[PDB]
Design a binder for this molecule. Sequence first.
Ligand SMILES: OC[C@H](Cc1ccc(O)cc1)Nc1ncnc2[nH]ccc12
Ligand SMILES: [Cl-]
Length: 167
Amino acid sequence: VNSFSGYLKLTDNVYIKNADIVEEAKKVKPTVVVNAANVYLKHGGGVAGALNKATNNAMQVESDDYIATNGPLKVGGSCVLSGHNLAKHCLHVVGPNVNKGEDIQLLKSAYENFNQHEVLLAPLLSAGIFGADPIHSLRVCVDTVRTNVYLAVFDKNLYDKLVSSFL
Ligand SMILES: OC[C@H](Cc1ccc(O)cc1)Nc1ncnc2[nH]ccc12
Ligand SMILES: [Cl-]
C-alpha cells in the first residue's frame, strides 16, 4: 500500500491520472519523481522547467554541478539526483526529442531506467514539447516498465484520450 490517490489502474503495475506532476509530488513526496530531462540537464520548459521552478532553481544548480563533473547524459539514459522539496530522489530520464530528430526507438531504453526503482511518479516520456505521440509513449511504458509507475497527465483532453484509447 502506498499514498498515491485517485489513479486509474491500467495494468498490474501502471496507474494513470490527470494531474500536475509538480502538485502531485508536493503532496505525495514520493521516493522517486521522474524528470523529463535533456542530456545537458537544462531544465527550461515542460516538466523539467516546472519541476525546477518548484525547487526554486536548486535542481538546476545541482544539475550544473553534475554536468560539470560528468558531462552530458545519453539519449535514453538517466541519472539519480536529489528530489529537493518534491521527492526523496529525482530520476532524470532523457527520452528522444523528436523536435531534434532523435530516434524514437530510444524511448524504450529511456523507460528501462524506471525498472531500477520499485515505485515512481512519472510523466509520459517524450510527450509534450518533446514531440512524440503520447499514445505510443504509454504503449512503450506499459510494455517496458515492470516496477510500479504512477503516470501524471495534467492535460485533461489528453488524459481522457489516453484512457479512452488504451488497449
Ligand atoms: O508528457 C509530459 C507532459 C507533456 C504535455 C504538455 C502539455 C500538454 O497540453 C499535454 C502534454 N507534460 C507534463 N505532464 C505532467 N505534469 C506536467 N507538469 C508540467 C508539464 C507536465
Ligand atoms: Cl512538456
